[PDB]
Structure formats: structure tokens, C-alpha cells
Design a protein around this ligand. Structure first.
Ligand SMILES: COc1ccc(S(=O)(=O)N(CC(C)C)C[C@@H](O)[C@H](Cc2ccccc2)NC(=O)O[C@H]2CO[C@H]3OCC[C@H]32)cc1
Lengths: 99, 99
């Protein structure tokens, strides 16, 4: 389907048994979610944007359900003001920008 | 046209008669550009990003071309890691997300 941009493109994702509201963000290289528990090993990382940098934990190979698809990707967990779905996951579900 | 997301959706924009590279950002409500000179008066605006809040200069009804499409709208100028084209202008050029 087609998703208009008059409003923030929000979607409900399923991850780690939890439901979260997230933003389909083409400007985000990676997916960044608010503090939560995830299985497996992680590496500390620093990501920057408007306002500066925030420290996050990088988890790889995480299963995420979004827009009916079941995708695998890296998830960065940290003090982000909003849950963001980055390009690393958007590509997996075949999402593109059209005009 | 269609733009995939395997790489950053960087496009050429034209503002003030000069070409610049900007990021098509669906996760951004507004368009924020790096320091530059724009005509007329500006109003103050506070925007919050991933690392916190920053002060930006708000210019209205500014002529700006994105991917060759002409738009006239609000442009914010301030300390941003990269030029970002937000939904306020993405909607003016008929940009949508599809999957
Ligand atoms: C490495 O992985 C990364 C993932 C995400 C980011 S990032 O979040 O700083 N970024 C990138 C953008 C600032 C270039 C995504 C932007 O679209 C970012 C996502 C976001 C962050 C906080 C709150 C709302 C929305 N949008 C953003 O900064 O938008 C600015 C400009 O318009 C306003 O909308 C609300 C916030 C304001 C950085 C790195």
C-alpha cells in the first residue's frame, strides 16, 4: 500500500513479545528504540542527530514484525525520545520513497 | 521516480540559486538546513532531535527545489548534522512511502 506524509508515518511493531509505536524514518540509518530488554550480546555505540549524541546498546539479528512482514535486523536501544525504524529494516520489508 | 533505501536517500536541492545535498527524511516534521543566508526576517523555533533540543531560525515562504520539483515553504536553519528535507516539503513534492 501507500503511506501519505501529511502526518508522521507511525506503525506498530512486534519485538521481544512487546508492542511498540514507531516512526518509519528514511532519515535514520538504524532502528532506535527506547530502553527495553533484548536477548543476546550487544556492543556500546554512540549515535548523533539534531541535539547531539546519545549512547545506545547495539543488538544484532533481532526479529521484528512490521507492516505484516517478519524482518531481521540491528536494533539500537537507548534514551531516544521516539521509537525509530531505520533504513536497515525498511529495506527488508521492501519500502521505498516514491514521487 | 522511486528511491530505494539501501543507501541514504540524498538528493540535490536548489535554494538561493545554489545546489546542495539533502536527506529525504520522513522522520522529520520540518526541513532543517545547515548554516546559510536566506532573505527576509526570521522567527525563533525550538526543535527536538535524538540528542536533545536546538535553536533554529525559521524562514517562511522560501523557494526551494527538491529533485527538480519546485516548492515554497518553511525552512529552518541551525546546527544539524546534515541538510534534512522534512514532511512539510516532502508533501509539497508528492512524496510518499510505499511497500
Ligand atoms: C545511526 O542511526 C541513527 C538513527 C537515527 C538518527 S536521528 O534520529 O537523529 N535522525 C537522523 C537525522 C537527524 C539526520 C532521524 C531524523 O529523522 C530524526 C528522528 C527523530 C528524532 C527525535 C524525535 C523525532 C524524530 N528527526 C529529526 O531530528 O527531526 C527534527 C526535524 O523536524 C522535527 O521533527 C521532530 C524532530 C525534528 C541518527 C542515527
Amino acid at each position: 500500500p501507500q503511506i501519505t506524509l501529511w502526518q508522521r508515518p507511525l506503525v506498530t511493531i512486534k519485538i521481544g513479545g512487546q508492542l511498540k509505536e514507531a516512526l518509519l524514518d528514511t532519515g535514520a540509518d538504524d532502528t532506535v528504540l527506547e530502553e527495553m530488554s533484548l536477548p543476546g550480546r550487544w556492543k556500546p555505540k554512540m549515535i548523533g542527530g539534531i541535539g547531539g549524541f546519545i549512547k545506545v546498546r547495539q543488538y544484532d539479528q533481532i526479529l521484528i514484525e512490521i507492516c505484516g512482514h517478519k524482518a531481521i535486523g540491528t536494533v539500537l536501544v537507548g534514551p531516544t525520545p521516539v521509537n525509530i525504524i531505520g533504513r536497515n529494516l525498511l529495506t527488508q520489508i521492501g519500502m521505498t520513497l516514491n514521487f
